[PDB]
Structures are given as structure tokens and as C-alpha cells.
Amino acid sequence: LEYSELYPIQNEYRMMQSLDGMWKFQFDPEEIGKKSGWENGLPAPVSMPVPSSFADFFTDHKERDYCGDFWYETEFYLPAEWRNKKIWLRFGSITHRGTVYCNGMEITSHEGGFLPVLADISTVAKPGQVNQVVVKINNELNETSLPCGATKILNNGRKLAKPYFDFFNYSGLQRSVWVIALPEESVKDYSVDYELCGTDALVKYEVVTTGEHPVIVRLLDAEGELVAETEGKEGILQVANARLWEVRNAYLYQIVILITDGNGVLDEYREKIGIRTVRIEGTKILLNDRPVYLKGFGKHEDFPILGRGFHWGIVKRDFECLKWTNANCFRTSHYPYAEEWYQFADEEGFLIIDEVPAVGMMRSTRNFVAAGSGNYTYFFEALTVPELLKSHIADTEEMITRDKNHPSVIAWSLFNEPETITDYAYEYFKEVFAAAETYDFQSRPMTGAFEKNSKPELCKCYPLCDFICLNRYYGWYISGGPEIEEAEELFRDEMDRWKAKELNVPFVFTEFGTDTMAGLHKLPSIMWSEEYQKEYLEMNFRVFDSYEFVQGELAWNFADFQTTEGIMRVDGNHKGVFTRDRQPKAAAVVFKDRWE
Amino acid sequence: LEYSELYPIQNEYRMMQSLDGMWKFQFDPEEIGKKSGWENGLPAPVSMPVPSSFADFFTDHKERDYCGDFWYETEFYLPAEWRNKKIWLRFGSITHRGTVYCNGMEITSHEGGFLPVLADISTVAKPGQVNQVVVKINNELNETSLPCGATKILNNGRKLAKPYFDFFNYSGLQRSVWVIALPEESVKDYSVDYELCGTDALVKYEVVTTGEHPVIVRLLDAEGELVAETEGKEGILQVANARLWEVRNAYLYQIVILITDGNGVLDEYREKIGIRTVRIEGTKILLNDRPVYLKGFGKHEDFPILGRGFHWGIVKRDFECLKWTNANCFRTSHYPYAEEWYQFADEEGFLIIDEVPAVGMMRSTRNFVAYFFEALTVPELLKSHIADTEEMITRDKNHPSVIAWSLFNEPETITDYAYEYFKEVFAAAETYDFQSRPMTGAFEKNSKPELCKCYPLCDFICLNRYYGWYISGGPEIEEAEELFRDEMDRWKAKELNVPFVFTEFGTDTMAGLHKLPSIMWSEEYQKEYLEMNFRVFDSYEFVQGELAWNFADFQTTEGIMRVDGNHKGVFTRDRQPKAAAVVFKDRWE
Ligand SMILES: O=C(O)[C@H]1CNC[C@@H](O)[C@@H]1O
Ligand SMILES: O=C(O)[C@H]1CNC[C@@H](O)[C@@H]1O
């Protein structure tokens, strides 16, 4: 990467100033902004909170559902004392793609809506003056970038996003924005990897800087005491009597990376890390050499009004709920979350399966969204797939570079419900997995979540995985309700087929659930009732517990969340175990009791 | 028919005794009841209310969802004085099909779950003693009887009904049961038809009795005063200064039919009727020679716990709600209702489109759940459909409220096979209806104007459309409106010169789901959808009625698309208005 993914810090060498607040915002349905000079200021803006998704503020459909180009603008005073620094705009994300301007000048563009965008404004920044940032953003969906979908043009020319995925197309500036100042020679990246040696541990590391001066690396314990120190851009820190980062029992050291010229220090980067190992051994997931059974949820970045907008309050409530259920794990379904989620998981000892936004790659869904009105003959995969692969690999590189040093991150999920039953899909995913392994200094477990279409007899992609994640809805989409006994039979039949393959890898259920409307009670239960959610879960548990190789269960979903409206979604997806405002349905206690 | 459809009455000649109450009931999953003497009494019964659907009483899934054979039993004391009367068991209905036994003797069987079953127990009845009735009932769904569906067998032998229709498969004894006594020579049927002559009216009639004795027919006004009298099994009653039965302004005369033996009366049948005419003239629906625009709903027989169980309380609340919306009409979607609904509509001046249970006649839905009219079972289905049609029309023809027959809901209609099938149904209906009143059916969107072969059979055309719900809903609602107008422009271009009535349009709407801007499923979207539909309706002169789907939320089969039944109600299942109810009230005022 031609920029650093490192989270920004404030110290003697590095400065940061938040640009969060009310920005100026303007929709550009006619796509006239750039030729009209909007990069120098929006002509008729409204106010827009940052961070937030824009959609749910408005009271009219066309603004909520807006699809196309739209622009953000703000101004900030740059301290004069930042003069002799490399000055960057850092967006937590720009959803889905955008071009950043500063003081009227084009700085950078980015594709991918869920990872940081770094824009080097050093050459146009005006220290000791007010500066301007303008961002052109686009939220259309296509088949050459993630997540996948289509864009429909309505009779009036109005665009409408048509996802191939089951979540609302929230977009905008959904995460915090900073302007930061770095030393001219700085720490750009580092990687740690761990080895356990009895009571001791080794922290292997690499550091990438933007210069040639010597590097010193120190490790401090949770009290700030020096426990190890070495020199060089590559090395090993030896930690006596190491306090390991444990599941639901975190311990964090602080790594301190210094660039020196002998006379003094040029840069200092510090970050909390946790000494822990993760590996797959047969059907076991080993954390610090001991098996762990994953218990938790797929989540979303989703909350009323804010949409995917980041807020520490959502983090705090969600973790309190997670702990109350006795969970130990979540998957970042279906995109990398704001960095703060991982920082907090590190502190709380939660395990994370970190997922790239490779969702929407199922052919039947694509075809369905094309058949709506209307198309049944024209598709061009041969042309788009190579471009999609490039985008997928780029997002993977960005995710892993951003997240690798979190002790919480124990696995990469490289897809959710793609086509996997052709040799072509194998060749596609082989490249993604190869890239992931190359970018991950730890070479930690890699996986993806498979839809039921990936039958054990047909799937060509599970051998790429270190463990296999299954999304299954036996008792919801398949043989629901009065047919639930048949659902259980079908589920056991499938798992018997997996069993007979004797793959000797762990299986984790990454999704299972039922839409459940809080307050819908029925005796006997019906699909959509709270009681049916409980019974469905009990049936699933009986199945899970029948197979030795099943080593985790992440329910879909932690909480009800927003989707595109339609005949199958009653104000979003109601498969939450909690409501959207984070309160438990009856099924939450079922998990609490089982996971205790 | 070899029995009478006439509603039972109590007078000097006719007696009736209710058998409603707690009956004995037993499921028969192994299908051994008739092999094991159950017709002489159930061996291990539980109690079951009659009238009611059985399903929603139980607390376990297997009892609620029971599909197959199941049995009812009760005992009743027959008064000694009923000796030498013709004694009948009269079930308001037996859902879906069944065999009636009395005192251990097989009496009759019936196919069709929404019309009366008459069982002549004259030869086995024991006057002045306790008597027993046992009924074997079956609620499976097939493609040779209505309504249509399939029956799935789960790997353990357990049956599950798989409807091709969007309502829960409620079954059992859902209507009241009577034992009745009739004279040996009795009035079996009669028919009335009306002609308006200025301020006067003619009531044309025919009477069918079970004997050869003379018949006298009288007409009394609402106060019981004699206004007309004539002799003969066929005749005309002349009514001076007739008080017509009017929309939302009923007036009912009483017809009195006497069989005489010269110096005495052998039988008397009495029923309230209303003098009114209905006809289709060009694009207008004429009631008493004046155009009427139909305003109202499709309903169901559906209420919490009772299921389809009849109760006058449901009738009363529903009619109060209908009146509050300023409605004038409902369709008996998708089966004839209990007779009492029509009696009440007659009193309240509501117009009824009376619908036979010919629903589930779809190939798409059939193929998914399981070329509908090309299947070898079809000749049998046709016979069942015609039988139900004959029964419905014979039962309901003399209600002034009944102004049209709906002979199907959403069948396949785009092949010559379908045309030939429906031609037979319509021909039969015409033979049974003394009034030859308008016949129609409700068409699904698949019946494209360019493809449908069956609309020419209809006196007026009923469309079920969901532009803005199943087609281009939500953010695409402007596209939905364009598509709707495109279709209606295609109908307009045919210049058929017939009225169109929208018999369904609606959106699932969860009470209490509010959103600004609206989303599908919200109360606000229901309002916006309706407003869009009205704009379309009002753009076509030939559109002459709108019946919203549905009056109230109602039970369906469980599934991923039904959140505790169907929520397209304008009212909740307990009969309270969503926001959209006011929209109808204001428009229909
Ligand atoms: O249908 C569902 O509820 C889930 C199915 N698997 C993918 C999820 O994004 C989706 O939300
Ligand atoms: O889908 C619906 O809501 C309706 C479609 N037309 C037929 C109705 O029985 C059904 O309930």
C-alpha cells in the first residue's frame, strides 16, 4: 500500500485532529459536480452528520433511497505547528467509493466502502489557515467491486441500488474522519507473530518505515514496564513469564516502535497487542494450544438512525449483551467493521472472524435481481469476474494489513455465500486465499461462509479453508414450521455426508436463525414467533452436538438489522436474538444458558 | 339435489333442535375408525366445541396441524312428537368432506366444506329416545375437489396439508348443526326473480315440493300485512307501491309458501326476501335501474381461536366496521360463508358477491407447492366445482344481498383447456340461477389481457392486482403505477364495454409499524399504496368497484412470507382499524 493503515495516535511526533461533526452535503443526481466546480465548495448543501449513514435522516423516499454520486464538504483549521509534517486526511471509510479533494485539488480515490482511505494532502495543505475538504462519493452496486449488486435506472432516470446481499445499502461517511500529521520519516506498518515457549513467549516482528534510519522496538507490560527490547526492522522480542491474551480474559502489552538517528528520536508508534497463538489441529481450533469452542454471533454495523454510523455507545452496549450471553466470538458479517470494534474486542478478550465484503456473489440472486424487470438472457461474467477478483484481493490486502495485529482477530473470512461448485470458482478463490496468506504475517486460519448450494458433493472450494463455516437454515428457509422434523432429518443427512468425507477439519456454523417478531407469541409456536425461535435453536443445537467436528456456533444475527424493503423483510431482518435497540427476545436466554 | 337447501325454521309443521355444544372428537391417524366400529361411538374422545374449527384449541403442533381423518360424535334426545316426520340432520358444513352416521347406520357422504350437508335419518331415528350421530371427516387437499392443494406425508407417516391457496386449512364442524323434522310432503325449494314496473313490482316465483298437493304463495310486508297472494307452484306476485330493497337501505318482505289439502295446510315455509334487480348495462352495474359503485372488501370466515367457527358476534362487529367505512359490498372470498352472513347482509342492505371455493387452480403455485387444467384429474375437479356451484346457488339465490356469483379465484385462464372448463361451470351456474344474475370470477395478473381466454364468459370482470406490493413495491412504486396503467390501457383498448371491479389490492401491514418515509409493511405504506391505486382506478371510466384485500388480518399457513397469517387487513384480526381504514372511510363517504 502507498499509505499506512496504522490507527492514528497523538504524541510528540504525530498529531491528529477530528473532523467529525456536521458536514455540508449535496446529492448530485445529474452528475454535474466536477464540471461545475463542486470540488471548490458545494453550491446548495444541507447539513450531514459525520460519522453516520445518510439515509435514515430524511423524511422522503427519494433522499433515503438515493443512489449515485453525492458530495460532502467541511473546513478545518490546520495548526501552524504542523508545517514540517506529512499531513494526511484519514477517513475510517468512504462508502462505497470516492475521490478526495483538498483545497480544490484532487488527492486520491478509493474503491471499497469499509476500510480506511488515506489522502496525502502535504502538498496542498495550508498550515495556520482554514483548509477545505470535499469528497465525491458514489454508492452504486456492480459486479466488479464489493459488495456486489446492480443499479437499476427507473423510468425517470432515477437510480436505485439493487443489492445481491441481505442488508440495506447504507452509505456516506460512516466512520470518523481525522486530519493527521506524521514525521517525514515514519513507521508505516509493522507485523507481530507469536510463539509460546513454556512460561515464556517470543514476539517476532517486522517494521516498515518510510526511511533508512535505525529502528528500536520495545515491549511494555500492562503497567508500562519494559519487558523486552531489541533493534532492527526485523527481530524477536523475548518475553519471560509472558501473560498470555486469553479468551474472555485479555492481557495487552504495548509495542513501542522508535525510529532514531542516534542523536534523537524521529518517530514513535505505539499500539496495544496481545500474546496469543491460533492454529487448527485436526478438528480443533487451538487458542494458546488449548481447544476453544466458538460461541457467539454474526453482527452488523447497524443501529437506529445512525445506520452503520460508528458510535462507542453501540460498542459498549453490544459487548455488555455479548458478555451477558456468555459469548466469546463474533464474525464481522459482512465487511470489516470500524477499527474501534477490534480495539474493544482486544480489551474484552473476544475472538473475531474478520470478514472481507465478498458477499453477493451467488448466481441465483444475481439472476433474480435481473429478472425482476427485466432480463433473463444477458449476463457477462467472463468479463467482470477478473475485475471483481482484483477488487476482492485489494480489499483483502487492506483488511489484513489494517487488522493483523489485533489479538482478537483469529481468522479471516474471505467470502459469504458465493458460488463454489465450479473449477472456475476454485481458481478464483485460490488467488484470494494465496493473497491473504501473503499479506498475513501470522498466516492465521482462513475460511469463508458457505451457503447450502455448496453441497458436499459439489463444492470445489472448501479444501482451501483451514476450517469450514456453514450458513444453514434447516427449519427456516428449508422445511420450516410444521416441517421442522423433516428439517432436522435433512440437516442430519447433510452433516452425515460431511462426516463421511472425514475431512479432519473443524466446522463452525456461522449462521442459523429464524425471523422473529418481538412480542409475537403462539402456543403451539409458529414461524416468526418468539417460541419458534427457541424451538428452532434447540433443534439446531441437537444437530450440532451430534458431530465431533463441529467446534463453533455463531447465530444469525446478534440483532435485528436494516435490509432493503420487500415482501420478505418486515422492517429489515428480524433474525436478531436481540432487537435493534439491543434488548433480548426469549431466545437470548437460551443462548445464555447453553453457553454458560 | 336430493335434499333441500332451505334454512331450517320452526313452526306448526317444521321443527328444529340445535346440536351445538361440546361434541366428542377423536383424531384417526391410522385410518382405522371405520374398521373398528367408531361409527357406533368413539373409543377415546376428547371434547370439541361445535361450531368451531378444531385447530387453534390445542397447545401442540401435531394436533393443530392434523391432516387426515378425524371424527365427531354427539347424542341428542329426539322428541316423541317427531314420529312420522321426515327427520334430517342438517350440518351448516362439514369441512372438507365426510360421512354421516346415525345410530350406527351410514346415512350420507358429502364433498365440499363450505355448504350444508343434509342427512335423512328418517329410517333410523328413534323418536322419544336418545339418538347418536357420528361423523367421519377428512381435511386433506387434492386436485379433484375444492379448494385445491396437495397432501404431504412426512417420513413418520404424518400427513400435512399443502394448500395452493393463501389461507390456513381450518376444518371440522365450523357451523351449527341442527336436527330437524319436516312434513312428509314439504316445500323443498323455491326461487324468486323481480321485475320493476314503475312504482309497482312483480315477484316471479317457482316452488318445488315433494308432493302433488296445491301450493299457495303469499307475500307479507315488513309489518306482516298481506300485499299479494297467488296459487300455483309457478306464478307472479303483484306488489303495488313496492318498497324496494336498496343499497344500505334494506326493506324485506316475507314470502309464505303453503301446501294445502283443501281444508288444511300440510306445510308452510317462510323466508325474508327483498325486491331488487341487478343487471350489467354497458360499463355500469345497475341496482334497481341505478348505477352503483361497489365499495368494500374481500373477507374471510376467520377470528381468533374459533378459526372459521361461526358466531353472530363476529357478524355484528364486522358489519359495524363495514358501515363505519361507508362500504356497501363484500365478496365471500374464497368460499360460501355461513348462511347467517347473508341473512344479515339482507337486513343491512349490503351487496354480496358470492364465491364458490374454486381457489388454488394455479399451475405456478401448484407446481411450486407440489398445466393445471391439462391434468387427467380435471374432469373430476370439474364435477366437484359444478356440484359446489349448484349447491351455492341453490342455497343463496333468494337473498336480495347476493347480486353476483364469483365462480373462481385466480385460476389459470390462458389456455383453451381453461376456457372449455369454465364454459361448463358458467353454463351450469346459469341453469341453477332463476335470476340469471351476473357471473364473474377474480383473475390473477397471469391472466394477461392478451392471453386470457376466460374473461368473455363473465358478465363483469374482477381483477386482483398487487402493483405496488408483489410487483414493483416500495422504492419502485412509481414504476408499479406505470405498469398498472399500462395494463389498464390494454384492457381499455379492447373496448369490451363491461364493468371492471377490483376484487383485491392491498399490502401486508403490521399494526404499529410506523416509518417516515414509509416502508413496505408499515401503516404509512398501506395508505400510500391505496392512494396510488385509487388514482389508477379513477382514471378508467369502466372501473365500477373496489373491494380491498382484506377486511381483516387472517390466518394462513406458516411460512417465510406470512408473519402470523396475512396482514393485508385494513382492520386487525380483532377488528380494530389500522391507519388505512380512515382512508377508505373518507373516500367512500
Ligand atoms: O437470509 C438471511 O437472514 C441471511 C442469509 N445469509 C446471509 C445473510 O446476510 C442473510 O441476512
Ligand atoms: O397474496 C395475497 O395476499 C392474496 C392474493 N390473492 C388471493 C388471496 O387469497 C391472497 O390472500
The answer to whether A485 faces chain B, any CB pair under 8 Å, is yes
Largest CA distance in chain A: 78
The whole-angstrom separation of Cα A347 and Cα A368 is 43
The candidate with the shortest Cα–Cα distance to A9, out of A230, A259, A183, A135, is: A183
Residue A180 main-chain phi, psi, to 5 deg: -135, 160
Interface contact B520-A567, CB threshold 8 A: yes
The answer to whether A529 faces chain B, any CB pair under 8 Å, is yes
Tell me if B159 sits within 8 A of B151, measured CB to CB. yes
Ligand in closest contact with the CA of B409: 2
Instruction: Give the torsion through C-alpha atoms of A293, A295, A298, A302, to 10 deg.
Output: -140
Which residue has its alpha carbon closest to ligand 2 atom 1? B166
Tell me if A527 sits within 8 A of A481, measured CB to CB. yes
The candidate with the shortest Cα–Cα distance to B220, out of B276, B270, B268, is: B270
**Ligand 1 site residues, Cβ closer than 6 angstroms:** A 166, 334, 417, 471, 511, 556, 573, 575
Choose the catalytic residue: B5, B268, B504, B523: B504
Choose the catalytic residue: B410, B444, B487, B523: B410
The whole-angstrom separation of Cα B41 and Cα A167 is 58
Ligand 2 pocket, residue B435 CB under 6 Å: no
- Measuring CA to CA, how many Å separate A457 from each of A61, A384, A420, A426, A475? 45, 28, 11, 14, 22
Give the three-state DSSP class for B92.
coil
- Report the residue among B368, B526, B549 best suited for mutation to probe ligand 2: largest number of ligand atoms under 8 A from its CB: B549
Q: Given the C-alpha cell 481468522, which residue does it identify?
A: A411
The whole-angstrom separation of Cα B567 and Cα B136 is 34
Which residue has its alpha carbon closest to ligand 2 atom 8? B166
Ligand 2 mean position to B572 CA, how many Å? 16
Interface contact A529-B564, CB threshold 8 A: yes
Task: Enumerate residues 6+ apart whose C-beta is below 8 A from A256.
Answer: A217, A218, A219, A220, A268, A269, A270
The whole-angstrom separation of Cα B264 and Cα B271 is 21
By DSSP bridging, strand A15-18 and strand A21-27 are unpaired
Please list the residues that pair with A307 across neighbouring strands.
A303
Q: Around Cβ B215, how many Cβ atoms within 10 Å?
A: 23
* Interface residue of B516, B526, B563 to substitute, partner A, most A CBs within 10 Å: B563
Residue B20 main-chain phi, psi, to 5 deg: -65, 155
Tell me if B344 sits within 8 A of B426, measured CB to CB. no
Ligand 2 pocket, residue B444 CB under 6 Å: no
Tell me if B92 sits within 8 A of B310, measured CB to CB. yes
The burial class, CB within 10 Å (0-12 / 13-18 / 19+), for B62 is middle
Three-state SS string across A94-152, please? CECEEEEEECCEEEEEEECCCCCEEEECCCCCCCCEEEEEEEEEECCCCCCCCCCEEEE
The whole-angstrom separation of Cα A392 and Cα A394 is 5
Residue of B nearest to A518 (CA): B563
Please list the residues that pair with A113 across neighbouring strands.
none
- Measuring CA to CA, how many Å separate A524 from each of A486, B62, B302, B545? 18, 9, 18, 40
The whole-angstrom separation of Cα B320 and Cα A118 is 66
By DSSP bridging, strand B97-102 and strand B105-111 are antiparallel
The answer to whether B535 faces chain A, any CB pair under 8 Å, is no
Tell me if A428 sits within 8 A of A385, measured CB to CB. yes
Largest CA distance in chain B: 78
Q: Around Cβ B431, how many Cβ atoms within 10 Å?
A: 13
The candidate with the shortest Cα–Cα distance to A28, out of A135, A126, A183, is: A135
The candidate with the shortest Cα–Cα distance to B297, out of B279, B316, B272, B322, is: B322
Q: Given the C-alpha cell 451477558, which residue does it identify?
A: A324
Residue A575, annotated as binding a ligand: yes
Three-state SS string across B3-69, please? CCCCCCCCCCCCEEEECCEEEEEEECCCCCCCCCCHHHCCCCCEEEEECCCCHHHCCCHHHHCCCCE
Ligand 2 mean position to B409 CA, how many Å? 9
- N-term to C-term CA, chain A: 43
Ligand 1 mean position to A437 CA, how many Å? 27
Interface contact B558-A482, CB threshold 8 A: yes
Ligand in closest contact with the CA of B502: 2
Q: What resolution, expressed in A, was reported for this entry?
A: 1.3
- CA geometry: angle at B367 spanning B31 and B508, to 5°? 95
Which chain B residues are closer than 8 Å to A529 by Cβ?
564
Which chain A residues are closer than 8 Å to B561 by Cβ?
567-568
Which chain B residues are closer than 8 Å to A480 by Cβ?
558-560
**CB-side neighbour CA atoms (13 Å) of B570:** 28
Smallest Cβ distance to B520: which of A483, A529, A565? A565
Q: Shortest Cα distance from A479 to chain B (angstroms)?
A: 9
**Polymer length of chain B:** 589
Number of helices followed by number of strands (H, E) in chain B: 9, 30
Q: Given the C-alpha cell 499509505, which residue does it identify?
A: A3
Smallest Cβ distance to B561: which of A59, A523, A568? A568
Cα–chain center distance at A466: 20
* A511 classed as catalytic: yes
Tell me if B259 sits within 8 A of B218, measured CB to CB. no
Ligand in closest contact with the CA of A365: 1
Which chain B residues are closer than 8 Å to A477 by Cβ?
560
Handedness of CA A73, A77, A80, A85 (dihedral sign): negative
Q: Given the C-alpha cell 434488548, which residue does it identify?
A: A583
Strand residue runs (E) in A215-331: 215-220, 226-231, 234-239, 253-260, 265-273, 278-281, 284-287, 290-291, 294-298, 329-331
The whole-angstrom separation of Cα B136 and Cα A515 is 38
C-alpha cell of residue A106: 484532487
C-alpha cell of residue B148: 385445491
**Cis geometry, peptide bond prior to residue B51 (ω within 30 degrees of 0):** yes
Interface contact B160-A373, CB threshold 8 A: no
Ligand 2 mean position to B200 CA, how many Å? 43
**Helix, strand, coil percent values for chain B (each to nearest 5):** 20, 35, 45
The burial class, CB within 10 Å (0-12 / 13-18 / 19+), for A385 is middle
C-alpha cell of residue B124: 333410523
Give the three-state DSSP class for B580.
helix
Q: Around Cβ B316, how many Cβ atoms within 10 Å?
A: 11
Q: Around Cβ A129, how many Cβ atoms within 10 Å?
A: 10
Q: Around Cβ A437, how many Cβ atoms within 10 Å?
A: 14
The answer to whether A478 faces chain B, any CB pair under 8 Å, is no
By DSSP bridging, strand A129-138 and strand A97-102 are antiparallel
The whole-angstrom separation of Cα B100 and Cα B104 is 10
Tell me if B467 sits within 8 A of B433, measured CB to CB. no
Task: Name residue A172's amino acid.
Answer: G
The burial class, CB within 10 Å (0-12 / 13-18 / 19+), for A364 is exposed
The whole-angstrom separation of Cα A172 and Cα A168 is 13
Dihedral-angle region of residue A172 (phi above 0 means left; psi in -120 to 50 means alpha; beta otherwise):
left
The candidate with the shortest Cα–Cα distance to A476, out of A547, A395, A568, A553, is: A568
How much is the CA Rg of chain B, to the nearest whole Å? 24
Interface contact B520-A486, CB threshold 8 A: no
Residue of A nearest to B466 (CA): A567
Smallest Cβ distance to B517: which of A64, A515, A523? A64
The 10 Å CB-count burial string (b at 16+, else e) for B277-308 is bbbbeebbbebbeeebbbbbbbbbbbbeebbb
Residue of A nearest to B67 (CA): A482
Q: Which helix (H) or strand (E) holds B272?
A: strand B265-273
The candidate with the shortest Cα–Cα distance to A444, out of A210, A192, A221, is: A192
- Measuring CA to CA, how many Å separate B411 from each of B334, B349, B372, B408, B474? 12, 30, 9, 7, 27
- Report the residue among B504, B553, B557 best suited for mutation to probe ligand 2: largest number of ligand atoms under 8 A from its CB: B504
**CB-side neighbour CA atoms (13 Å) of B79:** 11
Choose the catalytic residue: A5, A143, A417, A553: A417
Give the three-state DSSP class for B324.
helix
By DSSP bridging, strand A284-287 and strand A290-291 are antiparallel
* Interface residue of B305, B558, B561, B562 to substitute, partner A, most A CBs within 10 Å: B558
Please list the residues that pair with B352 across neighbouring strands.
B330, B402
The 10 Å CB-count burial string (b at 16+, else e) for B345-381 is bbebbbbbbbbbbbbbbbbebbeebeebbeeeebeeb
By DSSP bridging, strand B159-163 and strand B149-153 are antiparallel
Cα–chain center distance at A137: 20
C-alpha cell of residue B85: 316426520
Q: Which atom of ligand 2 is nearest to the CA of B359?
A: 9
* A355 classed as catalytic: no
Give the three-state DSSP class for A331.
strand
The candidate with the shortest Cα–Cα distance to B400, out of B563, B521, B254, is: B254
The whole-angstrom separation of Cα A439 and Cα A396 is 8
By DSSP bridging, strand A46-50 and strand A149-153 are unpaired
Write the DSSP string, A371-428.
HSSS-SS---HHHHHHHHHHHHHHHHHHHHHHHTT-TTEEEEEEEES---SSHHHHHH
Write the DSSP string, B237-252.
EEETT----BTTB---
The candidate with the shortest Cα–Cα distance to B427, out of B447, B2, B278, B419, is: B419
The burial class, CB within 10 Å (0-12 / 13-18 / 19+), for A430 is middle
Task: Enumerate residues 6+ apart whose C-beta is below 8 A from A196.
Answer: A242, A244, A275, A277, A288, A289
Tell me if A480 sits within 8 A of A487, measured CB to CB. yes
Q: Shortest Cα distance from A374 to chain B (angstroms)?
A: 11
Q: Which atom of ligand 1 is nearest to the CA of A334?
A: 9
The whole-angstrom separation of Cα B503 and Cα B499 is 12
Write the DSSP string, B338-407.
-HHHHHHHHHHT-EEEEE-S-B---HHHHHHH--GGGSTTHHHHHHHHHHHHHHHHHHHTT-TTEEEEEE
Q: Around Cβ A320, how many Cβ atoms within 10 Å?
A: 11
Number of helices followed by number of strands (H, E) in chain A: 9, 30
Q: Which helix (H) or strand (E) holds B321?
A: helix B312-324
The whole-angstrom separation of Cα B108 and Cα B100 is 5
The whole-angstrom separation of Cα A441 and Cα A205 is 9
The candidate with the shortest Cα–Cα distance to A534, out of A480, A578, A589, A485, is: A589
The whole-angstrom separation of Cα B15 and Cα B182 is 7
Interface contact A526-B564, CB threshold 8 A: yes
By DSSP bridging, strand A507-511 and strand B187-197 are unpaired
Tell me if A109 sits within 8 A of A159, measured CB to CB. no
Tell me if B108 sits within 8 A of B100, measured CB to CB. yes
Which chain B residues are closer than 8 Å to A64 by Cβ?
517
Q: Which atom of ligand 2 is nearest to the CA of B508?
A: 3
Write the DSSP string, B135-185.
EEEE----SSSSS-EEEEE-TTS-EEEEESSSS----B--S-EEEEEE-SS
A–B CB contacts, 8 A cutoff, strictly below = 96
Task: Enumerate residues 6+ apart whose C-beta is below 8 A from B39.
Answer: B33, B101, B104, B106, B134, B136
Sheet of B21-27: strands edge to edge?
A: B46-50, B21-27, B69-77, B130-138, B97-102, B105-111
C-alpha cell of residue B300: 374471510
Tell me if B562 sits within 8 A of B292, measured CB to CB. no
The answer to whether A531 faces chain B, any CB pair under 8 Å, is no
The candidate with the shortest Cα–Cα distance to A270, out of A336, A226, A213, is: A226
Task: Enumerate residues 6+ apart whose C-beta is below 8 A from A174.
Answer: A51, A52, A53, A92, A93, A95, A113, A301, A307, A308, A309, A310
Ligand in closest contact with the CA of B331: 2
The whole-angstrom separation of Cα A414 and Cα A433 is 8
The burial class, CB within 10 Å (0-12 / 13-18 / 19+), for A593 is exposed
Q: Given the C-alpha cell 487451538, which residue does it identify?
A: A286
Interface contact A566-B473, CB threshold 8 A: yes
Q: Which atom of ligand 2 is nearest to the CA of B334?
A: 9
All structural domains of chain B, each given as residue ranges with its CATH number in brackets, are: 1-183 (2.60.120.260), 184-277 (2.60.40.10), 278-589 (3.20.20.80)
Interface contact A567-B508, CB threshold 8 A: yes
Task: Enumerate residues 6+ apart whose C-beta is below 8 A from A423.
Answer: A460
Task: Enumerate residues 6+ apart whose C-beta is below 8 A from B404.
Answer: B278, B352, B353, B354, B437, B438, B439, B440, B459, B460
C-alpha cell of residue B433: 340461477
Q: Given the C-alpha cell 407469541, which residue does it identify?
A: A521
